[PDB]
């Protein structure tokens, strides 16, 4: 895939969501099957015993 990007066949892109879809996101105006995108976090621990 990296070789293709040098060849110019595939290029990076980042677009913005269309406004009409943005208004009608999971709900409003009776539209269905269009959820949001959700982000969270996790907190995992580590333990360190002491030797002597």
């Amino acid at each position: 895939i990296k070789k293709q990007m040098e060849a110019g066949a595939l290029v990076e892109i980042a677009e913005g969501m269309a406004t009409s879809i943005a208004e009608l996101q999971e709900g409003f105006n009776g539209s269905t099957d269009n959820p949001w995108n959700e982000m969270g976090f996790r907190i995992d621990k580590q333990v360190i015993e002491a030797k002597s």
């Binding site: 969270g40 976090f41 996790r42 907190i43 995992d44 621990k45």
Partner: protein, 52 residues
Amino acid sequence: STTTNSNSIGRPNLVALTRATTKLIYSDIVATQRTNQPVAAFYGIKYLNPDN
């Protein structure tokens, strides 16, 4: 949906200790008096009749 399962607890709080000691009864059951020699002597003084 980040629930409580994502979070990890730390050191649990130490709410209460619990020791077990008997309700010692010897300052009430017996008559105590400190002795100042390794050998303690009690005097028993009695009153008798002519028949002893």
